[PDB]
Design an enzyme around this catalytic site. Structure first.
Site, short mmCIF file in Angstrom:
data_model
loop_
_atom_site.label_atom_id
_atom_site.label_comp_id
_atom_site.label_asym_id
_atom_site.label_seq_id
_atom_site.Cartn_x
_atom_site.Cartn_y
_atom_site.Cartn_z
N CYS A 122 68.82 -19.31 80.97
CA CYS A 122 67.78 -18.81 82.12
C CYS A 122 66.23 -18.39 81.56
O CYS A 122 65.56 -19.09 82.23
CB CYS A 122 68.53 -17.70 82.63
SG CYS A 122 68.70 -16.01 81.57
N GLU B 74 48.06 -2.88 60.23
CA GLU B 74 47.33 -3.93 59.65
C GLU B 74 48.19 -5.16 59.74
O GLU B 74 49.47 -5.31 60.15
CB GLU B 74 47.37 -3.92 58.12
CG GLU B 74 46.73 -4.85 57.35
CD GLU B 74 46.02 -4.22 56.04
OE1 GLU B 74 47.00 -4.40 54.86
OE2 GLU B 74 44.93 -4.13 55.75
N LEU C 227 52.49 8.67 50.31
CA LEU C 227 52.33 8.41 51.77
C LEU C 227 51.75 7.13 51.90
O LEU C 227 51.94 6.45 53.11
CB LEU C 227 51.30 9.47 52.30
CG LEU C 227 51.77 11.08 52.13
CD1 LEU C 227 50.45 11.83 51.39
CD2 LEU C 227 51.80 11.78 53.62
#
Lengths: 582, 571
Positions: free
Chosen positions: B48, B319, B556
């Site tokens: 579909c 990014e 981090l």
């Protein structure tokens, strides 16, 4: 040719030593055409060819392919190839306060070392006070290792002005061209003396050259032409017309530039429903028309531009990009005409027509087998056959379909011809409008798209069922109906107001149009419509003559003349013999 | 199976999708079941979703993100114009809306009833008075009557200016219709996914020593090259992995497709203005060639990778590396090994289709029959080059891997050739374009008309730039792909789509981390999950979604040396 080395950007410099050739090779003129992918660069290995190719490969731009290098100095634009943008190009005379820059075109007038053609080089490096250039058809011996210039010219700066000195002493440098919007210090564009644009009548010496069968009936193309017209080109074959070589040069520049101007106008129309609505094209086709333009702007094979040309200048009237004809008369019949009765040194400007068409087809995306679709009409017979010759010369196989009777669909609902061969590439003589008329009542509010047939009780295929089929690649593309519609003239004018080749045109009557006098043309009396300043055709030896140029792949393909006793040329008006002379 | 049932308006063929009659294993993976038009992927034959994309494509030149199930189409707010990649606004109206269905509209069914789990999609082909004719695939399975160009007619009730459609099945839910228009009146606000579903969860395997030995095969050249660069390791503890919900993956699929187009638009803006372009630190001498690349090869990018921050607060892209993205091998092959060797659950690795997506892209590219793969003499590049070589082979290409530039030379005609004297005219590089840029950074565009690349040299010394900038060489990735990965594009992206749900407010001026002339972007740190900060990354392949992988670090800020983390998508 021989590889002498490379200019910056990896651009090859070749020797054009035609010498090492025999006249047997020089019989196939396809071997002399330099191309980068499908873009024609020029003749191997001329100076003009190196300059276009260098600009093309390093920046993606080119300039109009003028016959001689000194002519380049009169151009005021470069053409950005991918989107056909018209970029401003300025000319500066040697001794100019505008210093030469890297990438500038350096042009030589005719004379001395560059006798009748002048010359072009690309400035490749500014080494302090020396100007290094690369060029073709000057050096013919390999260059030292790693040298990416052909010659070094000394430049002198005195009193804020720059002067280049050639390495030859009998030459004349016209100056340099820079692609920039800044017109400070630039030369105004040369204007051709009006007298050279005059069309003159001429007469052949009557020695009965045309008293019998001067076209060969045995050649199927010429006989097909004879079946539709008789042994006839115009009313009096001993009469013909001539234009100057300078006028032709002007027609070649105008044709190329106008082609790009029409593409810009076409793009402006297609981006605005209020403008497009003026063209009377079924709304249901709008998405496909737009689609065609977005992907096939470069797929047009050939068109014809009609002008008014006399001492006042050159003015375009119309550009039929969809269903242009007169190719057979100009490219073949006029050649037999010249052969049979002309003995001067001039030439029929449409002589290169067939060869130009073949190159277009060779470098197109057409499929290996092309179905030619024409209406059952005697004039279309020879037009279709003339095009079939160009297709065969380019390597395509073809089948001519007259009317729609032999078309049917296979079991999978795919269009097939009489031999049961799938049809997926068509070159048509049919005007697209003929196909538009078959679905003019299909509402875009009721249907999602055109409800073309893919099967039918009596296996009856309509023109529109083939042209709008996604699996069929059609030439000319759908978008080509835009250029020929007079509704575009006001648009062309607003985009290039007061252009030397344009006639003041608008959707309302200006104050300029009242003072000038104007014609009202319905979307034709003289004083929703377009209003255009008056500019009637010159009358030359008892006939009003219209000058026409052929475009082929967007470039100049030749010139011919159409004449009539009325001030308005009709499709039935005759082609008149034309010879370009010095 | 694939039987022609008739055509919808415009000459669009309706096919029956009866799988039954054959293999399961192959219906999925075989390229023979992927429907295409020229080089554009339409869908899975003969579903579909596939019929709707192809109908829209052939008739209007537009498509919509290829979401996994029809019902998800309702959540989309744009259509993609293919030629120029324009983002066209798409609006959704519920059944019963004052906004009436139009011809050409997408009609979507939610899951349920006759359309069990997938939901359904059809196109409204004709408005015949009070009926609405549609065309669709995967519903009818017998040829249509001769000349009928719709699969079903549905009744429409107009009561009080509101239109309601009635389906032909009686246990289904019709969500509504979608129309491409800039008018938002009466339209549904775009659904937001509940934050809870966007959380990354830690999980552990039942440790039966599945990873004690060599679980990667050192007899396989590709896997052995991976081991030579990393050992028998994917991450620090292979018994530990992470999971995301199928709903989050669905969100990443959409975002990926949408963000690629958005980055193309910001790239165009950058290239249209020198002022903007000067911020990217690309040698000016390279500008005309860079623009030519953009103008001619926008559709030629093969693969890239988008890195996001993903959790309860939403999905945010950091990014998009469109030039030198890597991690394909870890995500597309090593994690497959990892799952095989130790995972016994019901979920799947979302980057499992990576190799086949890449093969398709290459097959549908304009790449030349023989492709030279150029890599630097670096251990991790060895396996990335070989992984890509495998996809090229699968797609029918011949290849040769060049390590460093030493075997390269020029023939008598100054054309580049490899150590065997074969002409080099098509290159896929693992080298970043910037490495080449560096070689001509001192070439002034005021002194030179174009880049003075070598076409010969005393010691036949070929530089990377002498290959990549050679006109006869067709390079992947194209030169323009250097633009998306540069931080200077973040403020342009923001200005083009302000407050877009996937973007972080970023500007050149302060409206707040500062990234190096600086860009300031809203603070938005990666979530820590089982001891590590986790980054979610999706691969783009031909501009489309090619999978997801995770990267994690104790710090981090994820570095390129940061670890790929096993990832499983579960219900």
């Amino acid at each position: 040719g021989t590889l002498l080395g490379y200019a910056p950007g990896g651009v090859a410099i070749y020797s054009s030593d035609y010498s090492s050739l025999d006249p047997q090779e020089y019989e196939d003129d396809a071997v002399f055409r330099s191309y980068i992918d499908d873009e024609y660069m020029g003749h191997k290995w001329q100076c003009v060819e190196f300059a276009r190719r260098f600009l093309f490969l390093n920046y993606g731009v080119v300039f109009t392919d003028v016959g001689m290098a000194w002519e380049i100095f009169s151009l005021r634009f470069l053409r950005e190839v991918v989107n056909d943008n018209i970029l401003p190009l300025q000319a500066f005379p040697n001794g100019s306060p505008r210093a030469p820059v890297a990438g500038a075109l350096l042009i030589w007038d005719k004379g001395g070392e560059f006798k009748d053609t002048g010359h072009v080089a690309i400035i490749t490096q500014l080494h302090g006070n020396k100007v290094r250039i690369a060029e073709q058809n000057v050096i013919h011996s390999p260059l030292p290792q790693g040298q990416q210039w052909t010659r070094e010219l000394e430049m002198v700066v005195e009193n804020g002005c720059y002067t280049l000195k050639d390495t030859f002493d009998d030459t004349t440098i016209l100056g340099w061209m820079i692609q920039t919007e800044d017109t400070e210090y630039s030369l105004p564009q040369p204007e051709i003396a009006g007298e050279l644009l005059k069309i003159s009548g001429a007469r052949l010496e009557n020695k009965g050259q045309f008293d019998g069968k001067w076209l060969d009936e045995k050649d199927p193309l010429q006989n097909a032409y004879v079946q539709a017209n008789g042994q006839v080109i115009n009313q009096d074959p001993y009469h013909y017309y001539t234009i100057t070589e300078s006028a032709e040069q002007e027609l070649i520049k105008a044709t190329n530039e106008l082609h790009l101007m029409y593409l810009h106008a076409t793009d402006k129309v297609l981006k605005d429903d209020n403008l497009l609505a003026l063209f009377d094209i079924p709304k249901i086709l709008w998405p496909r028309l737009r689609l065609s333009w977005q992907r096939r702007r470069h797929h047009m094979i050939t068109g014809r531009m009609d002008f008014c040309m006399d001492e006042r200048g050159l003015k375009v009237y119309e550009y039929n990009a969809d269903s242009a004809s007169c190719h057979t008369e100009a490219g073949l019949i006029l050649e037999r005409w010249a052969e049979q009765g002309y003995k001067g040194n001039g030439f029929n400007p449409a002589e290169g027509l067939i060869n130009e068409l073949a190159g277009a087809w060779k470098h197109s995306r057409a499929r290996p087998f092309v179905h030619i679709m024409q209406d059952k009409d005697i004039e279309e017979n020879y037009h279709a056959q003339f095009m079939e010759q160009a297709l065969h010369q380019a390597g395509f196989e073809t089948r001519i379909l007259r009317g729609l009777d032999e078309l049917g669909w296979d079991a999978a609902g795919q269009l097939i011809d009489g031999e049961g061969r799938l049809v997926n590439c068509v070159w048509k003589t049919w005007a697209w409008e003929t196909a538009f008329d078959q679905i003019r009542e299909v509402s875009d509010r009721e249907f999602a798209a055109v409800p073309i047939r893919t099967g039918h009780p009596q296996n009856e295929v309509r023109l529109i069922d083939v042209l709008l089929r996604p699996e069929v690649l059609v030439f000319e593309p759908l978008w080509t109906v835009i250029p020929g519609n007079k509704a575009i003239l006001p648009i062309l004018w607003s985009l290039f107001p007061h252009h030397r080749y344009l006639l003041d045109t608008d959707f309302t009557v200006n104050d300029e149009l009242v003072k000038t006098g104007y014609a009202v043309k319905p979307i034709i009396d003289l004083v929703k419509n377009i209003y255009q300043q008056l500019w009637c055709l010159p009358k030359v030896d008892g006939k009003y003559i219209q000058v026409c140029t052929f475009t082929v792949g967007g470039n100049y393909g030749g010139t011919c003349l159409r004449g009539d006793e009325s001030l308005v040329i009709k499709k039935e008006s005759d082609i008149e013999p034309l010879i370009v002379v010095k």
